[PDB]
């Protein structure tokens, strides 16, 4: 229907719209993570700064998928952004575990999104996921994996000194 639409399936178009909500949802969880560590009874400044950067990164991932849908001739369909599943995080380690479990879920959705472009014989869409999303989802999971293993080696979350020093040396 679009004048610039060529080799673009409806299933690929609908799968991009679903991914846009998944990145918008992810930035909402990172927004709720950042301002939990800004609380007076938590008071971890570099933990709040770290999750604030993650919030603005998932927003640009949703904006790049919104931009890709326009070049391919697709039409963006927007839905509700659901609230985060947890309104309280136990500690800094528990937040890094819920962020590692979140990135692995985002990476899983991209793998089947890449598996749908291949089935549809859409080579431009396959290269867009590999260049902008597949490579950065492995560094993100690896980096969060390092952060979690460095936290429970110091004795977190039982050791409040462990969270404070990780917040200073690693995150700062």
């Amino acid at each position: 229907t679009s004048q610039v639409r060529q080799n673009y399936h409806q299933d690929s178009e609908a799968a991009i719209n679903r991914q846009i909500n998944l990145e918008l949802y992810a930035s909402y969880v990172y927004l709720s993570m950042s301002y939990y560590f800004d609380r007076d009874d938590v008071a971890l400044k570099n933990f709040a700064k770290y999750f604030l950067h993650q919030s603005h990164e998932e927003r640009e991932h949703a904006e790049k998928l919104m931009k890709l849908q326009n070049q391919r001739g697709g039409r963006i369909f927007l839905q509700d952004i659901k609230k985060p599943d947890c309104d309280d995080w136990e500690s800094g380690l528990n937040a890094m575990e819920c962020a590692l479990h979140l990135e692995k879920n985002v990476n899983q959705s991209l793998l089947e999104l890449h598996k749908l472009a291949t089935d549809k014989n859409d080579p431009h869409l396959c290269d867009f996921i590999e260049t902008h999303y597949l490579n950065e989802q492995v560094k993100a999971i690896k980096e969060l994996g390092d952060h979690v293993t460095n936290l429970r080696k110091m004795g977190a979350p039982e050791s409040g000194l462990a969270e404070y020093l990780f917040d200073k040396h690693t995150l700062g």
């Binding site: 409806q10 299933d11 178009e13 609908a14 799968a15 719209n17 679903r18 909500n21 998944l22 949802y25 039409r75 369909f77 839905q79 659901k82 609230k83 985060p84 599943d85 979140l102 879920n105 959705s109």
Partner: peptide, 16 residues
């Protein structure tokens, strides 16, 4: 939990 609800949604709910 909320992540799998969006992920399992059929593609017909994401087309205009």
């Amino acid at each position: 939990d909320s992540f799998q609800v969006i992920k399992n949604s059929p593609l017909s709910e994401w087309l205009i």
